[PDB]
């Protein structure tokens, strides 16, 4: 995800599915290579203490001046027609200056972005359309015309460009927390399960204190926790032996 040779162009941002693995985030957060590391519903120090229902990495390249548009609730031509985060985003935005990887002395014109669109796109939607845009009130057809445009523009990345006009690689990690049966987890070791005694438990990052006992409740396969009228968890399915 972080060291692949060729990142996607931002109009066609690649999404990778992360699953069935141990995610040590402490190496990512401690590495001073990342210029941005902003988390929107968790602390970057707590990511190891936790599990995630599904995890995705969205990877793309942009200009340093547009990195502010990758935050949730934003506006501007990247947030409008290339890559929109949801206003309730949970995850971490990670970005680093890729001028040693994505800039060429004549310009690395391989990194496109969408320059026109009829209206702004939905959160985590991907616009791949190559149809000719109409700016004027006239209709337009075929390959070109007056007040008509190809909807994609290319970024001129050269290692001569001024500070903020160099390329930056972005990974947005997005996930849903503590609600459901997880398959990505931080590097924590499990203990044995202690029943009938008052204990500080932690199931998949759901920390608490209580007496655990054998339940006659049957959960369906898609359920990991049970709740009370007060929203407190009052039952759980053990993640190693599915009791």
């Amino acid at each position, epitope marked *: 995800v972080f*060291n*692949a*040779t*060729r*990142f996607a162009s931002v109009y066609a941002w690649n999404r990778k599915r992360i699953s069935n693995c141990v995610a040590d985030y402490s190496v990512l957060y401690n590495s001073a290579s990342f210029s941005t590391f902003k988390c929107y519903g968790v602390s970057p120090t707590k990511l190891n203490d936790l599990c995630f229902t599904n995890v995705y990495a969205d990877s793309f390249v942009i200009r340093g001046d547009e990195v502010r548009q990758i935050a949730p609730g934003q506006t501007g031509k990247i947030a409008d027609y290339n890559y929109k985060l949801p206003d309730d985003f949970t995850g971490c935005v990670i970005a680093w200056n890729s001028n*040693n*990887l994505d800039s*060429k002395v004549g310009g*690395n014109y*391989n990194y496109l972005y969408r320059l026109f669109r009829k209206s702004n796109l939905k959160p985590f939607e991907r616009d791949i359309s190559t149809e000719i845009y109409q700016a004027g009130s006239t209709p337009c057809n075929g390959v070109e015309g007056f007040n008509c445009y190809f909807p994609l523009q290319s970024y001129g990345f050269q290692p001569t460009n001024g500070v903020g006009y160099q390329p930056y690689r972005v990974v947005v990690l997005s996930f849903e927390l503590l609600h459901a049966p997880a398959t990505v987890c931080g590097p924590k070791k499990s203990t044995n399960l202690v029943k009938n005694k008052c204990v500080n438990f932690n199931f998949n990052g759901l920390t608490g204190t209580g007496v655990l006992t054998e339940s006659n409740k049957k959960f369906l396969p898609f359920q990991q926790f049970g709740r009370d009228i007060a929203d407190t968890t009052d039952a759980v399915r053990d993640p190693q032996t599915l009791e």
Partner: antibody
Framework: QVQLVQSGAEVKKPGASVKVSCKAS????????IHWVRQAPGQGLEWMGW????????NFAQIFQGRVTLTRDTSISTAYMDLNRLKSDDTAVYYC?????????????????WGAGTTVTVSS | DIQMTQSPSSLSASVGDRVTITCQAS??????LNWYQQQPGKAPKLLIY???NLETGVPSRFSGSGSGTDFTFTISSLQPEDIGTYYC????????FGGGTKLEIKR
């Protein structure tokens, strides 16, 4: 265990055509370019072209442009090189080689994983 | 095109000798160069990339240096597995190889 497995030795008449194949395994076949490189008997390497296995887009060295055709079957992770109207000095070892998955520059080609090479012999 | 030339077409070197082989591009190539070794009867192997980045798992003796038109590859002390042809390759505009330098053991 990344690998590129090629067709066995090919033997051909002048003016004919040859279909070398390159079965990939151990990595996601769409992730990176596959280059085609050749080597005549007792001589240096010569890059022919590439295919991007995700988009099917191709680029060729000028000597081969209008001669070589590059294709791929993503359902069987196999890239192909077809070379038309063969001349005697097209007698060469033909390699497919992958374009480095990690740590490179975003423009750069490289040749990090190479296939075993397929000898083509073109003669009367 | 970018034409590339390697200065020794072959270079006899003893076990433990230092080997230096120089590759020159016709145009200015900045640092857009790779180096590959071909041992007799095998496909080439990438050793240095981006003119001086040493590849994963290759011996520490191999070095690459220089930028612009003129570049060097070096073996700090030669070992009898290093014997083969060494090729430079530009990547600024369609990946052209150099003519290759054969090493051989001096006797």
């Amino acid at each position: 265990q990344v690998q590129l497995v090629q067709s066995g030795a090919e033997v051909k008449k002048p003016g004919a055509s040859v279909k070398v194949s390159c079965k990939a395994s151990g990595y996601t076949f769409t992730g990176t370019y596959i280059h085609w490189v050749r080597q005549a008997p007792g001589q240096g390497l010569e890059w022919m072209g590439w295919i991007n296995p995700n988009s099917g887009g191709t680029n060729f060295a000028q000597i081969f442009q209008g001669r070589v055709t590059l294709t791929r079957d993503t359902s069987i992770s196999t890239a192909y090189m077809d070379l038309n109207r063969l001349k005697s000095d097209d007698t060469a070892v033909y390699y497919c080689a992958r374009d480095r998955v990690l740590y490179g520059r975003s423009f750069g080609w490289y040749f990090d994983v190479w296939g075993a090479g397929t000898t083509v012999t073109v003669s009367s | 095109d970018i034409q590339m030339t390697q200065s020794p077409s072959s270079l006899s070197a003893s076990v433990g000798d230092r080997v230096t082989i120089t590759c020159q591009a016709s145009q200015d190539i900045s640092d857009y160069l790779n180096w590959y070794q071909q041992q007799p009867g095998k496909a080439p192997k990438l050793l240095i990339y981006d003119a001086s980045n040493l590849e994963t798992g290759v011996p520490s003796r191999f070095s690459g240096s220089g930028s612009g038109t003129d570049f060097t590859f070096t073996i700090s002390s030669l070992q009898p597995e290093d014997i083969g042809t060494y090729y430079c390759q530009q990547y600024d505009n369609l990946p052209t190889f150099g003519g290759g330098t054969k090493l051989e053991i001096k006797r």
